[PDB]
Design a protein around this ligand. Structure first.
Ligand SMILES: COCCN1C(=O)/C(=C\c2ccc(-c3ccc(Cl)c(C(=O)O)c3)o2)S/C1=N\c1ccccc1
Ligand SMILES: [Cl-]
Ligand SMILES: [Cl-]
Ligand SMILES: [Cl-]
Ligand SMILES: [Cl-]
Ligand SMILES: [Cl-]
Ligand SMILES: [Cl-]
Lengths: 152, 147, 151, 152, 151, 152
């Protein structure tokens, strides 16, 4: 019912944890339709130790990962709403990834904004597409299909 | 075969983003077969996911990109540690990836990449990731080598 | 210059992971003031234990981030963007005073450091200012440092 | 109320965890009055990776953090004694820091002794002040005011 | 019985990252022997300092992994795959003798542990064997474990 | 030639680095005879995260590793003294370990003192033995034979 979520609510919905929880705040959310979130990029992240020495560049694949989590938050809330209890036993598997294009490198100090739209969704299978943006510009484009499942 | 110390002399990637442990097969301007061991003792598992260790699909793709990278560096300048150290690799595009089987601690993740097309510093490769002969994922990507 | 990105910052401060808390410098006035910032994201080790389920960027690290900004300020003022000389210097902080924390800092915040030169006499520099998140002051502090030869 | 607490007791009272729990043991404790504790400094701490390369130096701001935590243990035990139950529902916020002076650099192999006395205390607000020592000499001095708040 | 994957291992052993050095149990025989392994990959924090520009999995860790396997063997021999009882027991090692290192272990290797029960009396279990990579012996060791009640 | 060394000297002799450099300081050193050194044990170490949760215990094998490093520093200096040049062209690799007995658990707050005596030395082959002590009490004991090898 809300459209603005902070790190606290994100931890209660997504199963991801450090160092793979790549969504910091949800700024906009329209159930079954779109979501806008963002992750701040800082030099104080471990992934920078090796990507790359003396040249910090946020991995392209982790940007895709960040987008998937945004969509995963959109998918869970659209299904069961904000129910951490239900969410606490679910995980999220990647099914496919297509048409991803990287236009501008993301670096420390960047506010990487995730913009996801629901292209199609069936039960637990959600297919989203959108872009990663920094200062209003598209730094990345991507389409992906993820499935949420109950931890067996 | 090229072992970890050779890989270090070519790829610019370091911990914790160096996801290729050994190169078992290489054919210039053609293909490459390499792999990375998966063990619980990897930091990514603390968060992906707690109680349910699953190697991230995106990192599977990253491992293939790196395998592709080694293939490009060596095809471009051969095994030249000197040239390599001035470069880094940028992901340009990723397409047609599909995950069929989850990778978990104890798995030997094999990368199979063939050159689909290349020009200058821009290389496009495609293939699969395998575990015990079984295809756990396929993908296509285009990377760029630069200064 | 007036805008230094992470690479420029890396060539001036000796600080490295996980103690380099200045991601970018948005403005610098030799001998006057500096405005920089560090993004705060959940993907930082410190949040693992401060605290579980309640990510709150440590106040001591805000102050530290403020000290680093002042250090870049004092140094650039004296020698400008000079990587070679930076390697032979040391910015050792002697005191911290009047520190106030008004509102907590959390993942998703852009922690802006605002520091100015309160006093400069020889090797001793005294800076002061605030850390701000979206125009609102979240913390303040006065710090004194001494410039010196590395060893 | 004890006066000799170990890491096991400390884990049960303070909310801090790795890599921010900077107190290893409590040696002396006088409810509402003073406390003596310490943190061993070893090269095997991640913080030394970047502070600094080739020459390890425990950060001063972190020494102040350790004194604050010592103070917190005193406050908690002062208000509820050793009660892990009510202690789990809390966290400690830094309110102010004053008169901190750094006299001697702290390094790997040092036994950082935290010396703190209560300057003032009302309810959840505790104002403490003292020194951090190593082998009997004062390496740092500081005053701080913390607050214990419901993890609401 | 049969083979256990990391999941099952997590339910018996109390060890967690970065100290759980057994990824899979491919063979177990009550009161007799165990065959397990840990994959060695460059992506392990340990390789940062052992050593720079020269990754070599520590020998004492090869030994730690043999102990964990041996411990796993003794525990399951008495109680089988019983998670509840596992939280009830403590398996620490009293002794370690006859340790020999023959070949360096590096990223890409599959460190296979081969431990057999030499002798056991009550809760004192003595195991011994080798660490193997590609069928060859990279290390040998004998360890004595004591099984106790947690707390 | 000296008998007291600090982490800054240790770093110039041993190649070990975080998180495997387990000797913080050397308080005693007698060529070809013995070495007494120590490593502080603090909760702020990665190892404790999983060994074990809610029960920090410094790994016995790590105590042994620490003893081996001291032996290594001893072996090298006995032969070349404090020589950074040569030190970084050689490596002390261990061939065997015997009679290892763990008597008392090591925990955060402990000062793990390493005591190694030279049992036999002939060229590059060194056999040493000793104990790990905490507050004058033996917590561990072991014997090792090391080989000083070329680094290339
Ligand atoms: C390799 O031997 C292990 C070292 N060791 C222990 O593990 C000891 C007890 C122990 C192990 C695990 C736990 C434990 C306790 C509470 C919890 Cl909550 C957990 C958990 O949650 O995972 C685990 O306690 S004692 C010991 N070493 C020695 C050494 C010498 C004498 C006695 C013990
Ligand atoms: Cl995935
Ligand atoms: Cl990239
Ligand atoms: Cl705080
Ligand atoms: Cl400092
Ligand atoms: Cl070793
Ligand atoms: Cl142990």
């Amino acid at each position: 019912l809300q459209s603005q979520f902070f790190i606290e609510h994100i931890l209660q919905i997504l199963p991801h944890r450090y160092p793979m929880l790549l969504v910091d705040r949800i700024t906009e959310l329209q159930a079954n339709q779109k979501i806008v979130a963002y992750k701040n990029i800082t030099f104080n992240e471990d992934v920078f130790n090796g990507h790359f020495p003396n040249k910090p560049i946020f991995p392209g694949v982790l940007i895709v990962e960040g987008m998937a989590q945004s969509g995963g938050f959109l998918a869970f809330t659209s299904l069961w709403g904000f129910d951490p209890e239900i969410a606490k036993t679910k995980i999220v598997y990647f099914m496919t990834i297509d048409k991803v294009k990287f236009r501008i490198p993301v670096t420390p100090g960047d506010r990487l904004e995730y913009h996801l739209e629901v292209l199609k969704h069936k039960g637990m299978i959600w297919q989203v597409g959108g872009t990663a943006q920094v200062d209003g510009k598209v730094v990345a484009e991507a389409e992906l299909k993820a499935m949420i499942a109950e931890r067996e």
